[PDB]
Design a protein around this ligand. Sequence first.
Ligand code: ANP
Ligand code: ANP
Ligand code: MN
Ligand code: MN
Ligand code: MN
Lengths: 250, 704
Amino acid sequence: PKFIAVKLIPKGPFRDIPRADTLFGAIGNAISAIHGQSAVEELVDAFVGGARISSAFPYSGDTYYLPKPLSVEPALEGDEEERYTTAKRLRKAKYLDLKNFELALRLRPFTIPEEIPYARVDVPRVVLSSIYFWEEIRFREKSGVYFLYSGPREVFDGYIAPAMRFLGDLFEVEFHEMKIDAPGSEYSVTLSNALPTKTPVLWRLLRKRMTFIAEGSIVKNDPGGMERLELGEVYVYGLTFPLGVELPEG
Amino acid sequence: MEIDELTALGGLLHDIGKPVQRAGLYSGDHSTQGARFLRDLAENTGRAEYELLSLFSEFHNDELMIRRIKELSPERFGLTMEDVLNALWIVYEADNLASPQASRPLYSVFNPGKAYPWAELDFEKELPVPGDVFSIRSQDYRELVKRLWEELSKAKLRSDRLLPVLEKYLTFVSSVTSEGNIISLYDHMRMTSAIALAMLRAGCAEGRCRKEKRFLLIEGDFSGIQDFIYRVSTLKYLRARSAYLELIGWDVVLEILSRLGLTRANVVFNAGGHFMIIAQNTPDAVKELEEIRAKAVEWLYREFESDLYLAIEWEPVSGREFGREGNLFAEARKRLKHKLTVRKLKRFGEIKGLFECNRLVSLPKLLGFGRTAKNDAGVLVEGPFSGFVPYLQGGRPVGEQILVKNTLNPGEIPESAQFVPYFVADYFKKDPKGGVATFEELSMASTGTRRLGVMKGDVDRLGEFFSSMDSPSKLATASRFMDYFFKGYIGAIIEGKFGYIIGDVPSLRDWPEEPDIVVVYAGGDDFFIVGAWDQIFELAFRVRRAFNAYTGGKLTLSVGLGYFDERTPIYRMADVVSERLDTAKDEGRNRVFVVGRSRPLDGKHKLSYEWNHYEELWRTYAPRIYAGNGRLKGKLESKKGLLWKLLEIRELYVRDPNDVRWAYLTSDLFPELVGIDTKAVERKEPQPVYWVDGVLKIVLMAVR
Ligand SMILES: Nc1ncnc2c1ncn2[C@@H]1O[C@H](COP(=O)(O)OP(=O)(O)NP(=O)(O)O)[C@@H](O)[C@H]1O
Ligand SMILES: Nc1ncnc2c1ncn2[C@@H]1O[C@H](COP(=O)(O)OP(=O)(O)NP(=O)(O)O)[C@@H](O)[C@H]1O
Ligand SMILES: [Mn+2]
Ligand SMILES: [Mn+2]
Ligand SMILES: [Mn+2]
């Protein structure tokens, strides 16, 4: 399918690479400050109605990265001293470029990005005495972070676009159409961390207290779901962002 | 006795003939001569079960056997005749599924070209080193056979009392006396006992069990160990977590054995939170497993959330598949590893409800733990199935199972209580107070700079090497000898033993009597050790050389080293040494990340060093600049700046290894650095100047 890529161009280093729950939270906040809850409620309705946003991924120059689908971990047998070495380096990879992501979905052979467009530099500081560390994310030249939006343009223009500008005032925003070719399939990857409704096929747990399925997990026809809750009324985003994925039998 | 205990003990003693023949005692084939040994032993002391067990050495009609069995009146022990025929037949097939002079020693599984001197397994005596092939003297076997006889005379005739003495004495004994025979007798014995008891609980007087999937390979593996242990809020607590994971693991394995009615012989291995068990393939077993798998996970989730998971999987396997044809055992282990990878991508899937620190502070003077019921007085920790009561020196043990630390000798425990020997690398420097040293006291003990030393080491491509094992008994030897290097001999290596084997290693000080070293973990094929940075730097080279000797120089270590401010949190030190171990691995393996280093990002310059390369460099440069024990050489006391200048010069090769200025800036102290070496430029390799910081940075740290 085609999607809107929201490119975050960083004006300085970042703390996190935000995932779908944190992105929806931020957007929900900004929209409350711009249009009041009336708008928040219409945002949730649009999302519950089929609109979706991915977690943020790195982009480098004109290269978009996507999460490695957990679909290939058990397929990696698909030189014996090249087989063991390379297979362990795929199993560590968090990201593939678009081209290789599309190949991984079809269980065809693919290759890994050699350098990734961000290093984690966590800086130490002494306190009062002990050492504490603040993880920071440094970006290469013309490198940053993006998320995908699927849904009606009226919901993008009216809620997502304005919210993202407001959120920038640490970054500037620009958006471009993006196509991801994905096989038609019973099965799909989430490009977002999700609160699943069904039990999933393959997954990584992600603890935040909520239990999320990680980006790259595999579900069978699972929309995930949103949660409302009270603590002085906030919505937690856990909807799946599905792309079809070929599974190996086993 | 009952068939279950008989068939176990039987499988275990089927091949006790071998040690007696190779001693000059009964003048008969190992089979008949092993019969004479148990019968003779039975008649002495007066324990008739040995004469029942004697029938195993001699076996395939069967006219004589049926009558020989009859003369030994079975009803005496609560046994049928037909019962003993199956026990004998089972153990006969089991011996062939586990699967020439008579002075031939055990050839090393690591290097079949070299062989082990006869010795009894003792972690306090000399390090096992595969050396030149020597025939074993017939006296050495006769000395073995007599302690062997004196031990069985006083043992309780329960597999848990039989296994330890067979392991003390038959560990370094060839199972068959062919050239290049790799299999410990002890391992062949415990695997025949394992396979036999599996066939019994299988429902086999029978080739039905051989060509039908009547066995289960059960593989268990803890997921998130690294997080469970090294992601805290102190060294005491870190060691408590590590020790707690060993008991949680044992509580699961012993459960599986107890509920499937199996013996410790059925444990192929239990190392680094990874276990393998051969068991029966009855529908009563898979249900019994499914219950255990589920209650274990549900307990782990309640106790630590998603932090620590247990992936348990099993596979229907036939007798064919313990063997070779045209390698099916490897093929069967591979299919099972796959199931474990999938199960690890379904963490806590065995919950459906998923999608809707005073007791460890308390955890120096204890002998082991009692596996009692969860609600028992004195329980200090709980696993998913049972409570653990510390068994102290002056005290009495409590429980159905006693776990006993770093002995194969029960000592003073009650006769009813099952003996579980467990080995743990638990070296630590004692403080002024009796307790284990802090990160602070370890760092303070350093030559020069006060930094804590940290090193994570791991064996290269072990999975590949284990994959090349044909048989259960081969894998059992490889697995145990490997696990023992880390659980057994790393303590000795730290103490200062194996001086002649180790040799000259890079070093900054005279080795201490009580080294400022503390072991966090040493098991499987890897270790995490902390201590005074200089003692840690040296221990890396000691452990690599020990390991090179213990393998036949056929297996390799990679090591990640780190030198941190004593105030750095564990999670960060763990992360950095992990990153550096992976780097050593990823840049070729058989290499060590000695120190953090600047380099061209041109993909020609490795951060890691080949062990021999760094050992050469240290032999070349250290003696010219370093006197020892925190002191520069007298020449360089006023000229300490030339060392810093060589580093500033090496930076103008890092800025650009093509800009030829570092020729310009350049002594009779470092001759091989002044030139522009061309073999290097041609071979597409770094200039010698690139490598020297590895030595200088260590020496500048030692002299501050
Ligand atoms: N009791 C222990 N204390 C400390 N380290 C241990 C202990 N038992 C096992 N280990 C080590 O923990 C490491 C395994 O960590 P783990 O998080 O399970 O990663 P893994 O083995 O790479 N596989 P995975 O399950 O995917 O995470 C190995 O180096 C083991 O040797
Ligand atoms: N003594 C042992 N007996 C049985 N299994 C072991 C033993 N030591 C390690 N293992 C297991 O062997 C497997 C492979 O070891 P591991 O350290 O993960 O990587 P490797 O195969 O040695 N390759 P690498 O470390 O990357 O160079 C793991 O599942 C370990 O739990
Ligand atoms: Mn693991
Ligand atoms: Mn390894
Ligand atoms: Mn390992």
